[PDB]
Design a protein around this ligand. Structure first.
Ligand SMILES: CC(=O)N[C@@H]1[C@@H](O)[C@H](O[C@@H]2O[C@H](CO)[C@@H](O[C@@H]3O[C@H](CO)[C@@H](O)[C@H](O)[C@H]3NC(C)=O)[C@H](O)[C@H]2NC(C)=O)[C@@H](CO)O[C@H]1O
Length: 159
C-alpha cells in the first residue's frame, strides 16, 4: 500500500510511503541511515510522493517529477518508457535510483563520498541527508537544513 498522486502528502501518508521505501531498499543493500538521509530529501522534494509534479504542474516534463524530483522529468520518464516500466509508480522510481547507483548516474562527488559509499554509510541521517542534498539533488537553493531534521525524524519513526 502506497500513495501515488499529484498532491502534497500529510505526515501520516508520508509515513506509509517512507516505510515502504525503507523495506525495499534494505533488500538491495542500503543502510537505514542512507535510506533516511534520502527520505529526508524526498520529503522536501515531493512529500515522498512518486506521483508528484513540480508546482503540481501535471504533464510538464521540463520540470521536476517523482520522489526525488528528476529535473527535467523526461530524464526519468524517457528511461522508464524505454525500459517498459510504468513511469508513475513507486517501484519504477526506486528501480531508477538503483539503476543510478549501479551506473554512476546523477551523483556528483562534491563531498568526497561516492554514491556506492553513500548507500553503505553509517554516518548520521542528518549528515547523509546533507551529502545527498549536495551530491544528488542539487536544487537552486542549497540551504535546506530541514532535510537533515526530516532525515532524523524518519530514522526515529520507522522500523
Ligand atoms: C527551481 C529549482 O531549483 N529546481 C530544482 C532543480 O534544480 C532540481 O533538479 C536538479 O537541478 C540541477 C541543476 O539543473 C541538476 O544538476 C545539474 O545536472 C546536470 C546533469 O545533467 C549537470 O550537467 C550540471 O552540472 C548540474 N548542475 C548543478 C548546479 O549541479 C540536477 O541533476 C537536478 N536534480 C535532479 C534530481 O534531477 C530539483 C531536485 O532537487 O528540484 C527542483 O525544484
Amino acid at each position: 500500500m502506497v500513495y501515488v498522486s499529484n498532491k502534497y502528502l500529510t505526515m501520516s501518508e508520508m509515513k506509509v510511503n517512507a516505510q515502504y521505501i525503507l523495506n525495499y531498499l534494505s533488500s538491495n543493500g542500503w543502510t537505514k541511515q542512507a535510506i533516511c538521509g534520502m527520505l529526508g530529501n524526498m520529503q522536501s522534494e515531493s512529500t515522498i510522493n512518486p506521483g508528484l509534479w513540480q508546482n503540481l504542474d501535471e504533464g510538464n516534463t521540463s520540470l521536476g517529477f517523482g520522489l526525488v524530483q528528476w529535473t527535467p522529468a523526461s530524464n526519468y520518464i524517457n528511461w522508464a518508457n524505454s525500459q517498459g516500466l510504468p513511469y508513475k509508480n513507486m517501484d519504477s522510481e526506486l528501480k531508477r535510483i538503483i539503476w543510478e547507483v549501479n551506473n554512476n548516474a546523477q551523483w556528483i562527488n562534491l563531498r568526497d563520498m561516492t554514491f556506492k559509499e553513500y548507500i553503505k554509510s553509517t554516518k548520521t541521517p542528518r549528515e547523509l541527508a546533507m551529502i545527498f542534498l549536495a551530491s544528488y539533488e542539487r536544487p537552486a537553493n542549497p540551504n535546506q537544513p530541514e532535510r537533515g531534521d526530516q532525515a532524523e525524524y524518519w530514522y526515529k519513526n520507522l522500523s
